[PDB]
């Protein structure tokens, strides 16, 4: 029959376990039934037809493949359900180099380390946290993630030869429990050029 609301808003996390509860729809016997899905090539969700609890199924979700879903349910003796997928950090950052500095110039930018993550743009799961591997023993370069364009800015602190170094890329948040223990730090080297 007629529902108690107009548009159901729910959420579910990416790469969750099977038969995880997404949301619970209700109405004023009552037979809940999904009659349409707008993305329909996997059956990703499962509506419990007796009580109306949307469960996930044996094929798990993917935010990076499809950002959100929309399915219209029907109660027999209709309403939209908009399910937005919560992003987790299941994607390792990769780096797609030279630098030219002058003699004894303080706080001059060197170059921009480009980095291309594939998670949600603007969170901690896409912002690349740059650390050091070898080359900042004497305290020379400070590193920074520019949050608008995702670039590893390097800039002189103690001004000053081919003093090369290497960075290690990671995200600002922790990696997901299916992708951690597969990540290995690859030291990406950078040659500087003084004059």
């Amino acid at each position: 029959p007629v529902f108690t609301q107009d548009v159901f808003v729910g959420s579910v996390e990416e790469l969750s376990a099977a038969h995880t509860l997404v949301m619970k729809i209700n109405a004023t016997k009552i037979s809940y039934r999904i009659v349409s899905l707008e993305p329909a090539y996997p059956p990703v969700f499962y509506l419990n037809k007796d009580t109306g609890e949307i469960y996930t199924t044996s094929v798990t979700l993917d935010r990076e493949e499809h950002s959100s879903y929309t399915l219209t349910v029907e109660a027999r003796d209709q309403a939209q359900v908009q399910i937005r997928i919560l992003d987790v950090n299941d994607n390792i950052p990769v780096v797609e180099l030279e630098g030219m500095v002058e003699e004894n110039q303080v706080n001059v930018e060197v170059t921009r380390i480009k980095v291309f993550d594939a998670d949600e743009i603007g969170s901690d799961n896409w912002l690349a946290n740059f650390t050091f591997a070898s080359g900042n023993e004497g305290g020379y370069f400070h590193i920074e993630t520019d949050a608008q364009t995702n670039e590893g800015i390097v800039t002189l602190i103690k001004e000053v030869k081919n003093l090369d170094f290497s960075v290690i890329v990671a995200n600002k948040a922790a990696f997901h429990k299916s992708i951690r223990s597969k990540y290995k730090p690859t030291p990406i080297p950078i040659k500087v050029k003084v004059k």
């Binding site: 038969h19 499962y46 419990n48 044996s58 094929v59 798990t60």
Partner: protein, 178 residues
């Protein structure tokens, strides 16, 4: 009397389509008494369209749960199997150990491993097997819990057409309860 059969080539006795009343997939479960431990043998064959079109996706987790009682027979209304296990010629000796795999993190109740799924063209895509013993009581008449999980992740799908889901045989060992 030291083998719990399902049959070497059985009919359909498991349900993976969550919300379907008939059995639609076959699994062979053979548990033999070997001294103080019990050797394991499990594989899963699909017998419907929904199970055979599971592996057109990249991330698929298949779940099978078994809920034995205190005697040793499968409760056929809550577990994922629909036909209880039979001997070769009660069945408390094949059940897992209560004092070694106890009820409540508790990472001591787990047995991990690996099997393989050979595709329709042949690529040897590996599946990660997670066998979880007791750890959880669903009601007041269940007393022993066994739970399998075949978790696959891949960069691309194993097939683009429906053929047949057949996993490789998996071997495990757990402490039994006398």
């Amino acid at each position: 009397n030291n083998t719990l059969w399902t049959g070497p080539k059985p009919e359909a006795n498991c349900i993976i389509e969550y919300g379907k009343q008939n059995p639609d997939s076959k699994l062979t479960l053979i548990l033999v008494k070997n001294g103080g431990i019990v050797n394991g043998y499990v594989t899963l064959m699909g017998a419907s369209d929904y199970v055979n079109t599971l592996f057109k996706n990249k991330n698929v987790s298949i779940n099978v749960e078994l809920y034995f009682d205190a005697t040793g027979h499968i409760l056929p209304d809550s577990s994922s199997l629909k036909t209880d296990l039979e001997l070769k010629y009660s069945a408390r000796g094949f059940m897992p150990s209560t004092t070694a795999y106890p009820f409540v993190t508790h990472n001591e109740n787990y047995i991990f491993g690996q099997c393989y799924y050979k595709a329709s063209d042949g690529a040897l895509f590996p599946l990660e097997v997670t066998v979880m013993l007791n750890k959880r009581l669903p009601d007041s008449r269940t007393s022993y819990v066994m739970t399998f999980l075949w978790s696959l992740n891949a960069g691309l799908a194993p097939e683009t057409t429906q053929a047949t889901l057949i996993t490789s045989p998996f071997t495990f060992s757990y402490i039994r309860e006398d």
